[PDB]
Amino acid sequence: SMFLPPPECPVFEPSWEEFADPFAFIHKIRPIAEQTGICKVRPPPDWQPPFACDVDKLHFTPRIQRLNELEAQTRVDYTLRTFGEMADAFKSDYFNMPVHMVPTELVEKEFWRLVSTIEEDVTVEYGADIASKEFGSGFPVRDIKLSPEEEEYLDSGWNLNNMPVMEQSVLAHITADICGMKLPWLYVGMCFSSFCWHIEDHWSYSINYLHWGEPKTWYGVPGYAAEQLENVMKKLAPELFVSQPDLLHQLVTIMNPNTLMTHEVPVYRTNQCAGEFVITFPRAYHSGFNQGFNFAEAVNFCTVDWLPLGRQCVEHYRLLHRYCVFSHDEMICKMASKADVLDVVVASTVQKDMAIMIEDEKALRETVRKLGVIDSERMDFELLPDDERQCVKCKTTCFMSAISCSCKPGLLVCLHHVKELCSCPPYKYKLRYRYTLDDLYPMMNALKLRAE
Ligand SMILES: O=C(O)CC[C@H](O)C(=O)O
Ligand SMILES: [Cl-]
Numbered sequence: 001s002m003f004l005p006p007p008e009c010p011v012f013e014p015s016w017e018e019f020a021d022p023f024a025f026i027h028k029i030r031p032i033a034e035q036t037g038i039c040k041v042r043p044p045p046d047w048q049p050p051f052a053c054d055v056d057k058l059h060f061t062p063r064i065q066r067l068n069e070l071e072a073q074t075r076v077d078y079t080l081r082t083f084g085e086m087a088d089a090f091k092s093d094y095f096n097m098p099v100h101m102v103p104t105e106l107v108e109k110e111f112w113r114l115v116s117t118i119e120e121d122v123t124v125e126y127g128a129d130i131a132s133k134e135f136g137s138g139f140p141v142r143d144i145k146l147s148p149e150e151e152e153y154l155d156s157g158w159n160l161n162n163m164p165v166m167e168q169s170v171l172a173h174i175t176a177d178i179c180g181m182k183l184p185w186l187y188v189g190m191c192f193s194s195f196c197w198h199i200e201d202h203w204s205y206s207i208n209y210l211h212w213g214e215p216k217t218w219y220g221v222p223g224y225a226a227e228q229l230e231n232v233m234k235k236l237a238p239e240l241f242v243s244q245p246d247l248l249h250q251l252v253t254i255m256n257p258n259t260l261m262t263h264e265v266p267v268y269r270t271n272q273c274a275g276e277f278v279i280t281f282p283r284a285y286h287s288g289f290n291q292g293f294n295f296a297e298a299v300n301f302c303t304v305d306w307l308p309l310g311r312q313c314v315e316h317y318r319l320l321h322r323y324c325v326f327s328h329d330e331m332i333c334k335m336a337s338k339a340d341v342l343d344v345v346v347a348s349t350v351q352k353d354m355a356i357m358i359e360d361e362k363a364l365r366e367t368v369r370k371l372g373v374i375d376s377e378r379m380d381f382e383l384l385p386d387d388e389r390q391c392v393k394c395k396t397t398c399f400m401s402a403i404s405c406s407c408k409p410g411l412l413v414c415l416h417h418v419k420e421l422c423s424c425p426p427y428k429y430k431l432r433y434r435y436t437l438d439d440l441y442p443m444m445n446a447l448k449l450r451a452e
């Protein structure tokens with residue numbers, strides 16, 4: 001009746017030994033956790049990264065949030081103290097109770113009541129920003145003079161600053177600017193502040209640590225059910241599914257998990273408490289809301305497990321005409337070009353993706369030659385700003401190749417949209433390519449040698 005909580009997602013309590021290597025652990029829980037999309041990880045009892053910051057010197061500008069189910073929201077001044085004061089007073093007055101007296105079950109039930117009730121117009125506020133000098137990681141980082149406890153945690157795989165640039169990770173090697181994606185984000189929550197249903201850019205993993213404060217309630221959907229969810233959502237809120245002019249205009253919304261569950265989309269929940277991690281798996285839809293004043297930190301990452309999905313995702317983006325954050329092929333080639341220093345399991349996995357890339361590229365080039373594109377010239381795509389190498393048609397970031405015509409200087413189409421560049425006959429076109437097929441096979445061989 002009214003709200004029936006989804007079943008609980010998996011909770012893991014790894015031993016210190018399991019905990020020692022986050023990517024090993026994540027790979028271990030994956031068979032379980034990918035069936036639920038999200039999972040919760042409680043570190044060993046004594047893993048306690050020290051949090052320390054001055055609540056008066058940390059400033060941020062909060063996002064205002066209206067709480068209306070199915071209403072469109074776009075995906076992307078207080079001190080921490082003054083936000084906290086506002087946040088505690090709001091929750092306190094909302095329930096006419098002390099903050100720790102309010103049951104999580106009640107806040108949840110009430111959240112889903114208020115977002116579906118037209119007459120209620122509750123607005124809340126929240127902080128979401130990347131780690132910067134004005135607002136840094138809640139984890140220890142090298143710079144100033146650090147206490148021995150902070151140095152214990154400096155190099156932790158679970159220190160979310162390290163997670164991106166570890167070597168079982170794939171996003172580390174990217175030389176392109178993807179700041180929004182490899183740098184941790186800080187989230188300052190208050191009661192009912194929420195994050196709308198979404199999946200990560202390029203279907204990456206995400207990992208979220210709640211440093212302190214009241215819990216964060218999560219809903220997650222396994223990756224296999226992503227399209228199922230999107231279909232449900234498209235029916236109830238087609239506005240969200242219109243073409244978006246860029247990445248800064250992605251539309252997202254609050255939606256009751258019971259709605260999803262009614263439509264046979266599997267949904268799981270959890271209350272993430274302070275000191276606990278939540279991990280989201282590739283293409284796993286998730287949303288939730290904060291129970292009260294709190295402070296979280298999250299970052300995207302990509303394992304070798306993810307590489308084929310990363311390629312599928314970019315294909316999926318092309319079909320949708322969605323902008324890419326980075327070129328997946330450029331990342332693959334960058335890694336190939338560093339085959340000798342790559343981890344060996346990484347090298348082996350990159351090699352397999354590269355082989356598909358090359359075979360696809362071979363077929364695409366044969367096709368455009370048969371269309372009468374004859375002229376060609378090598379081109380260092382990675383030197384162009386992203387906005388100068390997006391396919392006119394499908395907006396994909398070009399790297400392996402593109403078609404240009406002197407008729408339209410600067411414009412490019414990918415080899416899927418040769419027909420979409422201009423009205424000139426194909427013999428006026430140039431195939432611009434990063435590598436000849438003959439360049440590519442030795443790059444792949446280097447990987448094979450490294451993998452042995
Ligand atoms: O905590 C928020 O406000 C959003 C969390 C984000 O979706 C994540 O992947 O950690
Ligand atoms: Cl409402």
Ligand SMILES: [Mn+2]
Pocket residue numbers: 198199200206280286
């Ligand atoms: Mn997320």
Ligand SMILES: [Zn+2]
Pocket residue numbers: 318391392393394395396413414415416417
């Ligand atoms: Zn295209």
Ligand SMILES: [Zn+2]
Pocket residue numbers: 405406407408421422423424428
């Ligand atoms: Zn032309």
